[PDB]
Amino acid sequence: DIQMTQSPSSLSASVGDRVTITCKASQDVSIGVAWYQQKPGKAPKLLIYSASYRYTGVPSRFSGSGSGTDFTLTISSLQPEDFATYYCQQYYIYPYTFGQGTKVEIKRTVAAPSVFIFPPSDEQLKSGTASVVCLLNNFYPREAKVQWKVDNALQSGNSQESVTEQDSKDSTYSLSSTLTLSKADYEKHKVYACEVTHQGLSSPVTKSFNRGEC
Amino acid sequence: DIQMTQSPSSLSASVGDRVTITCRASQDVNTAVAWYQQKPGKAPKLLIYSASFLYSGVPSRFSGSRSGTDFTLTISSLQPEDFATYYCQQHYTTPPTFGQGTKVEIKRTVAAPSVFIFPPSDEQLKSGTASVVCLLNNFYPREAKVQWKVDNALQSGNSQESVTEQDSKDSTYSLSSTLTLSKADYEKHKVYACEVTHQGLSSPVTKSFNRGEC
Amino acid sequence: EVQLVESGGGLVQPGGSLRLSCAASGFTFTDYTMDWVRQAPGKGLEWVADVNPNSGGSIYNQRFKGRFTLSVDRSKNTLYLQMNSLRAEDTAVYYCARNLGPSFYFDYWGQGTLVTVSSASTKGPSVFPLAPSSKSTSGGTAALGCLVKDYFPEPVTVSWNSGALTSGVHTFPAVLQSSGLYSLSSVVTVPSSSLGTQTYICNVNHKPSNTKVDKKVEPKSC
Amino acid sequence: EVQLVESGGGLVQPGGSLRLSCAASGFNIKDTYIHWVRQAPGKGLEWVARIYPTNGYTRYADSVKGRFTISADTSKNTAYLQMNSLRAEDTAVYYCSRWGGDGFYAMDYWGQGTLVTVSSASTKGPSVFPLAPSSKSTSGGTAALGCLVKDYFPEPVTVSWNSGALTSGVHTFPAVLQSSGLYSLSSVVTVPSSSLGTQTYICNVNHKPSNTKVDKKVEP
Amino acid sequence: TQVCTGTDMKLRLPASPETHLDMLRHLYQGCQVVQGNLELTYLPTNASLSFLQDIQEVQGYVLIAHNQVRQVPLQRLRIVRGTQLFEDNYALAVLDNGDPLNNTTGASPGGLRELQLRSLTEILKGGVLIQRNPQLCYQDTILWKDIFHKNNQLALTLIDTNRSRACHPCSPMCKGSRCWGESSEDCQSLTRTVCAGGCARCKGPLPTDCCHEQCAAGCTGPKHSDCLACLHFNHSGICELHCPALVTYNTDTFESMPNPEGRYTFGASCVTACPYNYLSTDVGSCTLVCPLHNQEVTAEDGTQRCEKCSKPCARVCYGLGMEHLREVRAVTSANIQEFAGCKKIFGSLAFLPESFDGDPASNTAPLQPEQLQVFETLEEITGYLYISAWPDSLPDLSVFQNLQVIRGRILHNGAYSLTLQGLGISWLGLRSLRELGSGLALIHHNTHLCFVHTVPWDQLFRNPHQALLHTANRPEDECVGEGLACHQLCARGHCWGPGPTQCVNCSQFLRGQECVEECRVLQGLPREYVNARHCLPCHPECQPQNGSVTCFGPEADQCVACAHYKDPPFCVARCPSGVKPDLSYMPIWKFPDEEGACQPCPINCTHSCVDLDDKGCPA
Ligand SMILES: *[C@@H]1O[C@H](CO)[C@@H](O[C@@H]2O[C@H](CO)[C@@H](O[C@@H]3O[C@H](CO)[C@@H](O)[C@H](O[C@H]4O[C@H](CO)[C@@H](O)[C@H](O)[C@@H]4O)[C@@H]3O)[C@H](O)[C@H]2NC(C)=O)[C@H](O)[C@H]1NC(C)=O
Ligand SMILES: *[C@@H]1O[C@H](CO)[C@@H](O)[C@H](O)[C@H]1NC(C)=O
Ligand SMILES: *[C@@H]1O[C@H](CO)[C@@H](O)[C@H](O)[C@H]1NC(C)=O
Ligand SMILES: *[C@@H]1O[C@H](CO)[C@@H](O)[C@H](O)[C@H]1NC(C)=O
Ligand SMILES: *[C@@H]1O[C@H](CO)[C@@H](O)[C@H](O)[C@H]1NC(C)=O
Ligand SMILES: *[C@@H]1O[C@H](CO)[C@@H](O)[C@H](O)[C@H]1NC(C)=O
């Protein structure tokens, strides 16, 4: 293996942007280079062989460049068809090593998450899986430092989120994080909270319910 | 085709002296003659174009002439840096020939050798490669008489002769006088014999040490 | 033109083995060397193997040395790919592709498939509603849905009143929980004043389980 | 400046085949005649061949008549030399040159030359071995320090005086005929009694047929 | 060669059906393995066809249609495979044979009457079709599923058994009703039905009679080196699953080491190298077209190889049928733009009638003959050459003067490579043409066309099979009522057209493209030297001595001397003085000698030597 170093792992842009993402290798493989685009839930497609040559059918806006280990991939002008994870790859060294992927979103205006907590149910009161949902919706940008809490301290280890593949209409984020606990774990405390912080708004807002507040 | 005599091919003189070179043609070649200079490790660079014209970018200590088939390159003043192998050629017909390669030295006094020895160690004392290295200095000229003073044996075919590039401290050269037999000699005779004889030695000089000195 | 057909993706327990089939068409079969490449879900690509239709030489990973074997049928232009024992490290979508250059790189790509490595058998979804309370609803445009817990295998068909209204619908990508089970959540944003009369019914069917789920949402107070 | 590059030559098997090169600088060979002149090392010069690249018409010496073929790429503006059927006495120093000027039928501008010492490729290099250094028994007033190059065919030389920081007078014991065509000329420098023990005598010969770096100095 | 190429002309009537028979007789003579399709069409009862007996196997399929013979000589045919199929559905079709109720009182007008495919044992793919053949017996009693492959049973079979005559049965020397035909030589053998269990091929009821698993056509002894024709391959009598490996690996680094034991692939055969008009491959195949990013390079011996371009491979011009024109029959006014300066066209060239009077509906121009001047760099054609129409302004095919070789990989009707018909012109003018890699040459139905019999066709083929097809053209006795033939100087009278520019091999000299008697050495004003029967001027200075000449090579310094002046080694009629430096010195004002030496100036400037004792050097 040679460390395929794509920077970034994700970004966002507008229509018609010369954006360069490079995959510097940790060992000189300067000729045998591959480049790929894979759509979500689709096959990949070849982009550039040997880091210099556009393939038949690859449109004009692409540009394979860069030798040494610094290997230049550059869409000169972004199109809505180009929102896809891309890949660097060598073929100079056995065994043959892909990159790690770089997602492309659109840049637009940041937004307010629809921040909502979720109390449990009565068929859950016969089930036992104390699944509390921290629900967020319709915001921007990508990352949101969100975590759970217990009464003044955190809650970690056993909670799971659910990101969305992004819209093309307005490209707004939605997420449900579900802390799943036991029934005795619900019957242990009162205040279970959600540590919602995001750049699309300003103040660190916490929305929660309680045991008696239910 | 064409013969281009250079008589002689080597000569010695002093700094600040007239030069007389005999470049002899062979046929009805009329004019198209060029002179050349190259120092050891260099390119053959023009002295006289058009058989009478010194080439530009070069100082005018030179001289050109024309007489029959013996056309003469002349420098008014020999210099120590003005020192090479010297050449004359034609371009009257294809092929562009050459002269034999004549040479100008810096003369000194007929002198004596110096005091040096290099035998190897015991790893090169087992089987047939004897470096009886008799390094010399200061003697003059190259032209020598040939006799041998090597270990009371007849020497007809041991001759690995030598002369060097002239460093002109006293026209320094270094002649070589060696011997080669079964090399397993660390216990019999780890040293050997040398003496170099020349024209006007008023100082017979050689060197080889004696046994027991590693 | 150059297209591929892949088959063989199913379910196994950790330990067994399985065949594959990559059908090829529309090109000279003996002038390109079909290979295999995988990708882990939510993770990167990975090269698997390499073989000519000339020797049958399974040229593949040292990391997977001796574990998978290639058998071609160039009479039917179709190669098989065998399996071996592992413990869910290779639960990956498997891509058939042709070595476009005759070194190691690719242009075409099959539709591919994943093989599930699990000793856990199927399960219907544990039905739960994603009902916010009567107080903790939005001021005018609410949001609610159904929780799709603990089903197996993938994938499901979630809709609302047979897919009536997609205005603010949110069916999320599923996750596999720590007890190994797939689950997801699916909600929809409706106006809050419409909730006084209108109530939507989540239609969630899973055809390998062959069981549908119909459920509507009530903001029950405590 | 007209500047040329001669690269690629060296020891090949007798009978080898190779395209050499000669690259222009600040001119064009559209109006220039190109040449090659071999020279046996330390011997006389000898014209070989010539081209006019607009029409590629060739002349030759009779010793290389019909065997070699001159070639050039004026679109690359980079003249070449395809060599063919290398012989016994092809061991010579090549150089590329010009006839820039319709009156100027002279070759004063050159490149650098790459030595083409094609022969049977004897695989052996030198043997450099120490002594006991002192200053007691000087027969006169001068002792010795150096590294001589023996047992080698052809001549690559890497005899160092602290990585080539003292290039003062590598002497010459001009290369003699050993058994398999192996050679012996000096690199033992004539020294005064001043450089004894001031600098070490470390010499490591990167003898391209063998890389015979005897990591060892002669130390008298 | 035991291996040859089939044809592709499914149910089309032939081009020249009078001569169409003897096309086959040159083609399928002594060949055992067919790379194509055995297509036997429109054959009358007079056809002595016994040359078909040496045929063992067809890789493609076998079609027999519309003939008038009683029996066919196809009896050593062991097995068919069916790489291709007929109508994607059939591998052996015998259709429409005999006579379909015309106005013709004949006793045996034809129709294949028995199977008599005596050596046929297995069939891999496809279906079997028998329709519309009144003169057949013995076909119904045949168990096809044995002849079908066991592991390949796409068992569509339509055998129309409407007969028109009485069929007395076969010999009762057969074990049952299983018979090729009426002789006792003609019984249907068995390799699956009497076989049983895990045995797929057996030569008798014993398990010892069960054949080796790699053996398609049955076995003699029970080893793999004993069989009749093998399933996947045939490497030197050993029926391997694969051709041996062409590279040896580290098994750890997989480092590439060239195994010399390996072979290449070619159809049913593992062979060391590829045959003549084929391509060696990095994977080790012998194909027609290089794969992608792979250049058919000029190999060292001529046995070509596809190899990887480091850079992009160049835009090599696609002809008909390849990658841009895979359906277009003719050449239009539109596609003809692509051939600008092309010299090795990948693809064919077809000259239809509609090539020249273009459709205004499918709105193309009727072609201009002036546009045909684009084909004049053309060296080599991989495709074939169909010519059916030609301008009446041109008596020739002089557009193709420069064309050396036609490999003819893709063949016309699956068979043909040079197609000339329906023109009326008198000669061709193919002065560079020297080699046809495969295929046949057909020339027919042309009015004035002489000179073809003069063409020395022996130098133009690479098998002992491919002959010329002259018929239906200008008579030879009328070609000497012309009084014209090959010229005096043609070597053994071998010429393309009429006159001095037309000989195949000249006898004396080459003045451009004109073999001449002598060249101006000692006779004329533009004197020309000799370069191994090539006559070229000097830079115009072999000032013709009465008996001699003055600069041999066109570099103007060699025969003897100068003419007016000397700039040594060269000569001028006036000593020039240029301005364009490239180094700051001009040719400074060279004064002539008495004996012509234009000699330059002593002083730099301002003082002397402006050739007239005057001024003229600036500053
Ligand atoms: C598999 O490949 C092998 C080699 O790669 C090859 O075997 C060939 O088999 C044929 C048939 O046995 C051989 O041909 C024979 O040659 C001898 C020598 O000339 C002839 O005497 C034989 O004559 C018989 O057939 C004649 C046909 O004209 C009759 O006139 C005659 O009376 C005999 O009946 C026969 O022609 C051939 O030598 C070998 N080897 C090669 C290199 O071709 C064949 O391609 C495949 N064999 C199998 C069993 O699949
Ligand atoms: C074909 O053969 C038959 C006899 O079988 C003969 O009568 C007939 O004339 C032949 N055909 C021609 C065209 O001669
Ligand atoms: C055979 O002939 C009959 C009568 O013409 C017609 O049905 C058809 O051609 C054939 N039918 C069958 C069943 O083969
Ligand atoms: C032409 O004939 C001559 C006869 O001397 C022969 O030497 C030459 O090779 C022939 N050339 C060609 C192209 O056939
Ligand atoms: C050759 O002779 C003719 C007359 O016989 C004369 O005019 C001419 O000058 C001569 N020389 C040549 C052609 O060089
Ligand atoms: C000598 O003459 C040349 C051309 O006539 C000119 O370019 C050059 O400058 C002159 N030399 C000097 C020193 O000016």
CATH at residue A155: 2.60.40.10
Q: Counting runs of H as helices and runs of E as strands, what totals does chain A give?
A: 2, 17
Instruction: Give the angle B98-B104-B110 at the CA atoms, nearest 5°.
Output: 140
The neighbouring-strand residues paired with C213 are C204
Identify the CA nearest to A49 among candidates C105, E315, C103, C96: C105
Question: Could you tell me if the CB of E383 is within 6 A of ligand 5?
Answer: no
* SS3 call for E468: strand
Instruction: State how far residue E587 is from chain B, nearest Cα, in angstroms.
Output: 12
Pairwise CA distance, residues D87 & D80, whole Å: 20
Amino acid, single-letter form, for residue C204: V
Cβ atoms of B81 and B101 within 8 Å: the answer is no
Identify the CA nearest to D86 among candidates D42, D134, D38, D53: D38
Residue of A34, A137, A180 with shortest CB distance to C105: A34
Residue D166 corresponds to which tokens in the numbers above?
């003292």
Pairwise CA distance, residues C74 & C29, whole Å: 7
Alpha carbon E336 to its chain centroid, in Å, reads 23
Resolution of the structure in the document, Å: 4.4
Domain count, chain D: 2
Instruction: Indicate whether E352 and E463 sit together in one domain.
Output: yes
Instruction: Indicate whether C68 and C46 sit together in one domain.
Output: yes
- Give me the residue label for tokens 């089903």: C151
Contacts with C43 (C-beta within 8 Å, 6 or more apart), sequence order: none
| DSSP collapsed to 3 states, chain C | CCEEEEECCCEECCCCCCCCEEEEECCCHHHCEEEEEEECCCCCEEEEEECCCCCCCCCCCCCCCCCCCEEEECCCCEEEECCCCCCCCCCCEEEEEEECCCCCCECCCCCCEECEECCCCCECCEEEEECCCCCCCCCCCCCEEEEEEEEECCCCEEEECCCCCCCCEEECCCEECCCCCEEEEEEECCCCCHHHCCCCEEEEEECCCCEEEEEECCCCCC
- Regarding chains A and D, contact by 3 or more CB pairs under 8 A is answered as no
Residue E240's φ and ψ, nearest 5 degrees, are: -75, 165
Residue E126 corresponds to which tokens in the numbers above?
């496809």
Cβ–Cβ contact D190 with B under 8 A: yes
Domain boundary (A108, A123, A154) is at A108
Instruction: Indicate whether D129 and D91 sit together in one domain.
Output: no
- The alpha-helical segments, DSSP class H, found in E439-531 are 478-481
> CATH number of the domain that C140 lies in?
2.60.40.10
Alpha-carbon torsion angle E346, E349, E354, E358, nearest 10: 50
Distance E32 CA to ligand 1 centre (A): 10
Full residue range of the structural domain in which residue A78 is found = 1-108
Residue E22 parent element (H or E) = helix E20-27
Cβ atoms of C99 and C34 within 8 Å: the answer is yes
Distance E238 CA to ligand 1 centre (A): 14
Cβ atoms of A47 and A82 within 8 Å: the answer is no
Instruction: Indicate whether C114 and C203 sit together in one domain.
Output: no
Instruction: Indicate whether E553 and E607 sit together in one domain.
Output: no
> CA dist E9 to A208, B123, E55, E65, E70, Å?
81, 83, 20, 11, 23
* SS3 call for E354: helix
Pairwise CA distance, residues E545 & E552, whole Å: 13
Instruction: Indicate whether D170 and D216 sit together in one domain.
Output: yes
Q: Burial level of E525, CB count in 10 A (0-12/13-18/19+)?
A: exposed
Residue positions counted in chain D: 220
Number of the ligand 3 atom closest to the C-alpha atom of E162: 1
Pairwise CA distance, residues D22 & C41, whole Å: 56
Instruction: Indicate whether C6 and C98 sit together in one domain.
Output: yes
* SS3 call for E304: coil
> CA dist D98 to B4, B32, D23, D49, D64, Å?
22, 17, 11, 12, 20
Instruction: State how far residue E160 is from chain A, nearest Cα, in angstroms.
Output: 49
The percent of chain E in helix, strand and coil, each rounded to the nearest 5, is: 10, 20, 70
Chains that touch A (3 or more CB pairs under 8 A): C, E
* SS3 call for E145: helix
Alpha carbon A158 to its chain centroid, in Å, reads 21
Residue E405 parent element (H or E) = strand E405-406
Instruction: Indicate whether A86 and A188 sit together in one domain.
Output: no
Relative to beta strand B11-13, strand B102-106 is parallel
Asked whether residue E315 is assigned to any structural domain, the reply reads no
Q: State which of E546, E550, E551 you would mutate to test the pocket of ligand 5, scoring each by most atoms of that ligand within 8 A of its C-beta.
A: E546
Pairwise CA distance, residues E580 & E577, whole Å: 10
Identify the CA nearest to B73 among candidates B82, B86, B83: B86
Amino acid, single-letter form, for residue A28: D
Kindly report the number of other CB atoms within 10 A of residue D78's CB atom: 15
- Regarding chains C and D, contact by 3 or more CB pairs under 8 A is answered as no
Identify the CA nearest to D190 among candidates D144, D158, D157: D144
Instruction: Indicate whether B21 and B96 sit together in one domain.
Output: yes
Full residue range of the structural domain in which residue D107 is found = 1-120
Instruction: Indicate whether B185 and B142 sit together in one domain.
Output: yes
Asked whether residue E13 is assigned to any structural domain, the reply reads yes
**CA Rg value for chain C:** 23
Q: Whose CA is nearest to atom 14 of ligand 5?
A: E545
Residue of D61, D95, D174 with shortest CB distance to B162: D174
Alpha-carbon torsion angle B50, B53, B56, B57, nearest 10: 120
> Are E587 and D105 within 8 A, CB to CB?
no
Domain boundary (D120, D141, D159) is at D120
Instruction: Indicate whether E112 and E51 sit together in one domain.
Output: yes
Asked whether residue E565 is assigned to any structural domain, the reply reads yes
Domain count, chain E: 4
Residue D57's φ and ψ, nearest 5 degrees, are: -80, 135
> CA dist E185 to A62, C43, E52, E483, Å?
72, 69, 19, 61
Residue E348 corresponds to which tokens in the numbers above?
């064919």
Provide the number of CB pairs (under 8 Å) joining chain A to chain C. 114
Contacts with E31 (C-beta within 8 Å, 6 or more apart), sequence order: E1, E2, E3, E4, E54, E55
Instruction: Indicate whether B98 and B122 sit together in one domain.
Output: no
Asked whether residue E272 is assigned to any structural domain, the reply reads no
Residue C196 corresponds to which tokens in the numbers above?
């006084």
- Give me the residue label for tokens 């028979």: E21
Instruction: Indicate whether B200 and B138 sit together in one domain.
Output: yes
Instruction: Indicate whether A184 and A143 sit together in one domain.
Output: yes
Domain boundary (A87, A108, A129) is at A108
Amino acid, single-letter form, for residue A129: T
Contacts with E8 (C-beta within 8 Å, 6 or more apart), sequence order: E36, E37, E39, E411, E413, E414, E415
Instruction: Indicate whether E29 and E153 sit together in one domain.
Output: yes
Amino acid, single-letter form, for residue E514: E
Q: Counting runs of H as helices and runs of E as strands, what totals does chain B give?
A: 0, 12
Pairwise CA distance, residues A100 & A86, whole Å: 9
Kindly report the number of other CB atoms within 10 A of residue C84's CB atom: 14
Domain count, chain A: 2
Instruction: Indicate whether D53 and D3 sit together in one domain.
Output: yes
Instruction: Indicate whether E130 and E16 sit together in one domain.
Output: yes
* SS3 call for E264: strand
Domain boundary (D89, D120, D151) is at D120
Cβ atoms of E215 and E231 within 8 Å: the answer is yes
Give per-residue burial for E75-111: e unless 16+ CB within 10 Å, then b: bbbbbbbbbbbbeeebbbbbbbbbbeeeeeeeeebbb
Pairwise CA distance, residues A33 & A65, whole Å: 10
Instruction: Indicate whether E555 and E585 sit together in one domain.
Output: no
Identify the CA nearest to D57 among candidates C176, E554, E488, A75: E554
Pairwise CA distance, residues C195 & C140, whole Å: 10
Asked whether residue E353 is assigned to any structural domain, the reply reads yes
Instruction: Indicate whether C100 and C13 sit together in one domain.
Output: yes
Q: What is the DSSP string of E151-181?
A: TB----EEE----SS------TTSSSS-BSS
Residue B211 corresponds to which tokens in the numbers above?
């046994």
E224: left (phi over 0), alpha (psi -120 to 50) or beta: alpha
Full residue range of the structural domain in which residue E451 is found = 335-481
DSSP label at residue E495: B
Instruction: Indicate whether D26 and D103 sit together in one domain.
Output: yes
* SS3 call for E373: helix
Residue E24 parent element (H or E) = helix E20-27
Contacts with B144 (C-beta within 8 Å, 6 or more apart), sequence order: B175, B196, B197, B198, B199
Kindly report the number of other CB atoms within 10 A of residue E591's CB atom: 15
Instruction: Indicate whether B47 and B94 sit together in one domain.
Output: yes
Instruction: Indicate whether E443 and E563 sit together in one domain.
Output: no
Instruction: Indicate whether E7 and E147 sit together in one domain.
Output: yes
Residue E616's φ and ψ, nearest 5 degrees, are: 145, -20
* SS3 call for D151: strand
Residue B186 corresponds to which tokens in the numbers above?
């660390």
Domain boundary (A86, A108, A130) is at A108
Question: Could you tell me if the CB of E108 is within 6 A of ligand 5?
Answer: no
Q: What is the DSSP string of E80-132?
A: E--SS-BTTTBSEEEES-S--S-----SS-----S---TT--EE-SS-EEEES
Cβ atoms of C145 and C187 within 8 Å: the answer is yes
Kindly report the number of other CB atoms within 10 A of residue E348's CB atom: 25
Instruction: Indicate whether E552 and E615 sit together in one domain.
Output: no
- Give me the residue label for tokens 């047929």: D209
Instruction: State how far residue E569 is from chain B, nearest Cα, in angstroms.
Output: 5
Q: Dihedral sign for Cα C30, C32, C33, C35, please.
A: negative
Question: In chain B, what residues touch E569 (CB-CB under 8 Å)?
Answer: 32, 91-94
Amino acid, single-letter form, for residue E242: H
Instruction: Indicate whether E560 and E466 sit together in one domain.
Output: no
- The alpha-helical segments, DSSP class H, found in E437-595 are 478-481
- Technique used to solve these coordinates: cryo-EM
Number of the ligand 1 atom closest to the C-alpha atom of E235: 5
Instruction: Indicate whether B77 and B162 sit together in one domain.
Output: no
Pairwise CA distance, residues B18 & B74, whole Å: 7
Instruction: Indicate whether E37 and E185 sit together in one domain.
Output: yes
Cis ω before E500 (30° cut-off from 0) = no
Identify the CA nearest to B33 among candidates B88, B103, B95: B88
DSSP label at residue E214: T
Cβ–Cβ contact E291 with C under 8 A: yes
Pairwise CA distance, residues D132 & D112, whole Å: 42
Pairwise CA distance, residues E254 & A93, whole Å: 11
**CA Rg value for chain B:** 23
Instruction: Indicate whether C33 and C92 sit together in one domain.
Output: yes
Instruction: Indicate whether B204 and B135 sit together in one domain.
Output: yes
Distance B92 CA to ligand 1 centre (A): 72
Alpha-carbon torsion angle A184, A187, A188, A193, nearest 10: 110
Instruction: Indicate whether C137 and C106 sit together in one domain.
Output: no
> CA dist B65 to B33, B71, B73, D164, E543, Å?
11, 6, 7, 44, 33
Instruction: Indicate whether D156 and D81 sit together in one domain.
Output: no
> Are E600 and D103 within 8 A, CB to CB?
yes
Instruction: State how far residue E593 is from chain D, nearest Cα, in angstroms.
Output: 15
Identify the CA nearest to B146 among candidates B133, B132, B162, B168: B162
Domain boundary (C84, C119, C154) is at C119
Q: After which residues is chain E broken (C to N over 2.5 A)?
A: 104
Question: In chain A, what residues touch C138 (CB-CB under 8 Å)?
Answer: 114, 116
DSSP label at residue A184: H
Amino acid, single-letter form, for residue E565: Y
The neighbouring-strand residues paired with C127 are C148
Residue B31's φ and ψ, nearest 5 degrees, are: -135, -35
Pairwise CA distance, residues E108 & E167, whole Å: 14
Relative to beta strand E344-345, strand E440-444 is unpaired
Identify the CA nearest to E459 among candidates E485, E486, E432, E428: E432
- Give me the residue label for tokens 């071998």: E494
Instruction: Indicate whether A138 and A94 sit together in one domain.
Output: no
B151: left (phi over 0), alpha (psi -120 to 50) or beta: left
User: Strands (DSSP E) along E426-526, which ranges?
Assistant: 435-436, 440-444, 468-470
Cβ–Cβ contact E326 with C under 8 A: no
Instruction: Indicate whether D138 and D110 sit together in one domain.
Output: no
Distance A193 CA to ligand 3 centre (A): 86
Q: Burial level of B54, CB count in 10 A (0-12/13-18/19+)?
A: buried
Instruction: Indicate whether B13 and B104 sit together in one domain.
Output: yes
Instruction: Indicate whether E462 and E544 sit together in one domain.
Output: no
